[PDB]
Each structure stands twice: as C-alpha cells, then as structure tokens.
Amino acid sequence: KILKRLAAKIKKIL
Secondary structure, three states: OOHHHHHHHHHHHO
C-alpha cells in the first residue's frame, strides 16, 4: 500500500 510511502514523502517534505 502507499500509506507509509506517503508518510515517507511527507518525511521528505517534513
């Protein structure tokens, strides 16, 4: 799923 992947992108931005 892309749930944690989002949070990883969110970890990149944030």
